[PDB]
Protein backbone atom coordinates (compact mmCIF):
# COMPACT_ATOMS: atom_id res chain seq x y z
CA UNK A 1 0.00 0.00 0.00
CA UNK A 2 1.07 3.67 -0.31
CA UNK A 3 1.81 4.01 3.43
CA UNK A 4 3.85 0.80 3.40
CA UNK A 5 5.82 1.79 0.29
CA UNK A 6 6.55 5.18 1.87
CA UNK A 7 7.80 3.62 5.12
CA UNK A 8 10.12 1.27 3.26
CA UNK A 9 11.46 4.11 1.12
CA UNK A 10 12.29 6.02 4.29
CA UNK A 11 14.00 3.00 5.87
CA UNK A 12 16.06 2.63 2.69
CA UNK A 13 17.06 6.30 2.74
CA UNK A 14 18.11 6.12 6.40
CA UNK A 15 20.13 2.94 5.96
CA UNK A 16 21.94 4.29 2.89
CA UNK A 17 22.85 7.49 4.76
CA UNK A 18 23.95 5.64 7.91
CA UNK A 19 26.12 3.28 5.84
CA UNK A 20 27.85 6.22 4.12
CA UNK A 21 28.49 7.95 7.44
CA UNK A 22 29.74 4.80 9.13
CA UNK A 23 32.29 4.22 6.35
CA UNK A 24 33.64 7.77 6.70
CA UNK A 25 33.34 7.93 10.50
CA UNK A 26 31.00 10.91 10.33
CA UNK A 27 29.25 11.41 13.66
CA UNK A 28 25.47 11.40 13.42
CA UNK A 29 22.45 11.49 15.71
CA UNK A 30 19.04 10.73 14.21
CA UNK A 31 15.92 10.42 16.39
CA UNK A 32 12.64 9.06 15.02
CA UNK A 33 9.63 10.36 16.96
CA UNK A 34 7.03 7.69 17.79
CA UNK A 35 3.98 7.95 20.07
CA UNK A 36 5.55 10.31 22.62
CA UNK A 37 5.47 13.83 21.21
CA UNK A 38 8.84 15.55 20.91
CA UNK A 39 7.74 19.04 19.89
CA UNK A 40 9.70 20.73 22.68
CA UNK A 41 12.95 19.21 21.38
CA UNK A 42 12.11 19.83 17.71
CA UNK A 43 11.63 23.49 18.58
CA UNK A 44 15.25 23.77 19.77
CA UNK A 45 16.66 23.03 16.30
CA UNK A 46 16.57 24.55 12.83
CA UNK A 47 13.17 23.90 11.19
CA UNK A 48 13.29 21.85 7.95
CA UNK A 49 10.04 19.90 7.47
CA UNK A 50 11.87 18.31 4.58
CA UNK A 51 11.30 15.20 2.54
CA UNK A 52 13.60 12.39 3.63
CA UNK A 53 16.44 11.45 1.30
CA UNK A 54 19.76 9.71 1.89
CA UNK A 55 21.39 12.73 0.22
CA UNK A 56 19.89 15.30 2.58
CA UNK A 57 20.71 13.16 5.60
CA UNK A 58 24.37 12.94 4.56
CA UNK A 59 24.55 16.66 3.77
CA UNK A 60 23.17 17.57 7.22
CA UNK A 61 25.89 15.70 9.15
CA UNK A 62 28.99 16.80 7.26
CA UNK A 63 31.58 17.87 9.88
CA UNK A 64 32.08 21.59 10.64
CA UNK A 65 28.84 22.66 8.96
CA UNK A 66 25.91 24.63 10.41
CA UNK A 67 23.56 21.65 10.79
CA UNK A 68 25.88 18.90 12.00
CA UNK A 69 25.96 19.59 15.78
CA UNK A 70 22.88 18.13 17.44
CA UNK A 71 20.13 15.71 16.51
CA UNK A 72 17.99 15.35 13.42
CA UNK A 73 14.43 14.61 14.53
CA UNK A 74 12.12 12.81 12.12
CA UNK A 75 8.33 12.88 12.44
CA UNK A 76 5.52 11.79 10.09
CA UNK A 77 8.04 10.58 7.49
CA UNK A 78 9.71 14.01 7.11
CA UNK A 79 12.85 15.56 8.67
CA UNK A 80 11.25 17.97 11.18
CA UNK A 81 14.40 19.80 12.32
CA UNK A 82 18.18 19.51 12.52
CA UNK A 83 20.72 20.55 15.16
CA UNK A 84 18.23 19.83 17.96
CA UNK A 85 18.99 19.53 21.67
CA UNK A 86 18.46 16.16 23.35
CA UNK A 87 18.87 15.56 27.11
CA UNK A 88 22.07 13.88 28.25
CA UNK A 89 21.61 10.61 30.10
CA UNK A 90 23.17 10.26 33.55
CA UNK A 91 23.01 6.50 33.29
CA UNK A 92 26.12 4.87 34.80
CA UNK A 93 25.65 1.84 32.50
CA UNK A 94 26.71 3.33 29.18
CA UNK A 95 30.09 2.20 27.86
CA UNK A 96 32.64 4.53 29.43
CA UNK A 97 34.43 5.35 26.16
CA UNK A 98 31.32 6.91 24.59
CA UNK A 99 30.68 10.62 24.54
CA UNK A 100 27.91 13.14 24.38
CA UNK A 101 26.27 11.96 21.13
CA UNK A 102 25.57 8.55 22.62
CA UNK A 103 24.56 10.00 26.01
CA UNK A 104 22.10 12.33 24.26
CA UNK A 105 20.60 9.40 22.34
CA UNK A 106 20.19 7.37 25.53
CA UNK A 107 18.82 10.43 27.36
CA UNK A 108 15.99 11.06 24.90
CA UNK A 109 15.24 7.30 24.90
CA UNK A 110 14.71 7.41 28.69
CA UNK A 111 11.81 9.91 28.46
CA UNK A 112 10.22 8.94 25.12
CA UNK A 113 9.42 5.85 23.07
CA UNK A 114 11.59 7.20 20.23
CA UNK A 115 14.27 5.23 18.38
CA UNK A 116 17.62 7.02 17.95
CA UNK A 117 20.46 5.99 15.61
CA UNK A 118 24.02 7.05 16.39
CA UNK A 119 27.14 6.89 14.22
CA UNK A 120 30.38 7.18 16.20
CA UNK A 121 32.92 9.69 14.89
CA UNK A 122 35.65 7.69 16.60
CA UNK A 123 34.92 4.24 15.10
CA UNK A 124 32.08 4.59 12.59
CA UNK A 125 30.19 2.12 14.75
CA UNK A 126 26.41 2.23 14.50
CA UNK A 127 24.22 2.00 17.62
CA UNK A 128 20.55 2.46 18.51
CA UNK A 129 19.06 3.86 21.70
CA UNK A 130 15.59 2.83 22.84
CA UNK A 131 13.93 2.54 26.26
CA UNK A 132 17.11 3.74 28.06
CA UNK A 133 19.40 1.12 26.53
CA UNK A 134 22.09 1.41 23.89
CA UNK A 135 22.48 -1.40 21.35
CA UNK A 136 26.01 -1.22 20.04
CA UNK A 137 28.09 -2.31 17.07
CA UNK A 138 25.17 -3.06 14.78
CA UNK A 139 25.52 -4.64 11.37
CA UNK A 140 23.52 -3.28 8.44
CA UNK A 141 21.06 -6.16 8.74
CA UNK A 142 20.56 -5.51 12.48
CA UNK A 143 19.77 -1.83 12.00
CA UNK A 144 17.28 -2.67 9.24
CA UNK A 145 15.64 -5.23 11.51
CA UNK A 146 15.26 -2.62 14.26
CA UNK A 147 13.75 -0.09 11.89
CA UNK A 148 11.29 -2.61 10.46
CA UNK A 149 10.37 -3.79 13.95
CA UNK A 150 9.83 -0.22 15.09
Ligand X SMILES: CCN(CC)c1cccc(NC(C)=O)c1
| Residues of the shown chain interacting with ligand X in the complex, contacts defined by CB under 6 A | 16, 20, 54-55, 58, 64-66, 69
- Select the residue interacting with its own copies from 7, 19, 44, 53 (CB under 8 A): 53
Q: Which range binds its own copies by CB under 8 A, 36-44, 54-62, 90-98, 116-124?
A: 54-62
Q: Nearer to its own copies by C-beta: 49 or 123?
A: 49
Q: Considering CB distances under 5 to 8 angstroms, the limit depending on partner class, which of its own copies, Mg ion, ligand X, none binds residue 6? A: none
Q: Are 27 and 43 in contact (CB under 8 A)?
A: no
Distances (CA, A) of 135 to 7, 47, 78, 127: 22, 29, 25, 5
Strands 28-32, 71-75: parallel, antiparallel or unpaired by DSSP?
Answer: parallel
The CA-based diameter of the chain, rounded to the nearest angstrom, is: 44
Q: Which range binds Mg ion by CB under 5 A, 7-15, 29-37, 92-100, 132-140?
A: 132-140
Q: Nearer to ligand X by C-beta: 17 or 134?
A: 17
Q: How many residues bind its own copies (CB under 8 A)?
A: 21
Q: Are 111 and 88 in contact (CB under 8 A)?
A: no
Q: Strand locations in the chain, DSSP E?
A: 28-32, 46-51, 71-75, 78-84, 115-119, 126-130, 133-135
- Select the residue interacting with its own copies from 11, 58, 88, 146 (CB under 8 A): 58
Beta bridge pairs of residue 140:
none
**Closest CB 144 distance from Mg ion, rounded Å:** 16
User: Is 19 a residue that touches its own copies (CB under 8 A)?
Assistant: no
**Closest CB 135 distance from Mg ion, rounded Å:** 8
Amino acid sequence: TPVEEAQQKTIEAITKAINYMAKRRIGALLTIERDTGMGDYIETGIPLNAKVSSELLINIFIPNTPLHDGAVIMKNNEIAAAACYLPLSESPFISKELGTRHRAAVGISEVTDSLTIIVSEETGGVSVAKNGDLHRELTEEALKEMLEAE
